[PDB]
Curated annotation (Swiss-Prot):
GO molecular function, one term: transition metal ion binding
Disulfide bond annotation, renumbered to this chain: C1-C24
Biological function: Transfers electrons from cytochrome c551 to cytochrome oxidase.
Binding site for Cu cation: H44, C110, H115, M119
InterPro entries noted in UniProt: Azurin, BlueCu_1, BlueCu_1_BS, Cu-binding_ET, Cupredoxin
GO cellular component, one term: periplasmic space
Protein name (record): Azurin
Domain Plastocyanin-like, residue spans: 1-126
Origin superkingdom: Bacteria
Keyword Flavoprotein in record: no
CDD domains on file: Azurin
Name of the gene: azu
Length: 126
């Protein structure tokens, strides 16, 4: 596995490169959030996808807007999204690891309006 990742008010993250073990049936991510800069001024998503899909889930996800969770509905290009948290929250995602092959490249990110540039990392498997 579990990671404990957290973003600031800088538009950053920490763990801009994850590694999930194969000797582990599921994976869980926990997002937290640090200063008082609300979920309309700095919210952070932790969405996962492959570095060939991101443009979908960033773009289509900024289309959706706030309420939709800056990440559209269904998106079968996401294997894991937490939700848009903000200052003082925490949330979590407990996904399968079936859902990921090995020898694929997966990037993670925050679909809020422009933080998918400084907030990206990688998820390789194992
Ligand atoms: Cu963000």
């Amino acid at each position: 596995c579990s990671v404990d990742i957290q973003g600031n008010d800088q538009m950053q993250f920490n763990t801009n490169a994850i590694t999930v073990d194969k000797s582990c049936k599921q994976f869980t991510v926990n997002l937290s959030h640090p200063g008082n800069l609300p979920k309309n001024v700095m919210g952070h998503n932790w969405v996962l996808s492959t570095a060939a899909d991101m443009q979908g889930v960033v773009t289509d996800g900024m289309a959706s807007g706030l309420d939709k969770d800056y990440l559209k509905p269904d998106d079968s290009r996401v294997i894991a999204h937490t939700k848009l948290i903000g200052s003082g929250e925490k949330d979590s995602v407990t996904f399968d690891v079936s859902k990921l092959k090995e020898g694929e490249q997966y990037m993670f990110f925050c679909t809020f309006p422009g933080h998918s540039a400084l907030m990206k990392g990688t998820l390789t498997l194992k």
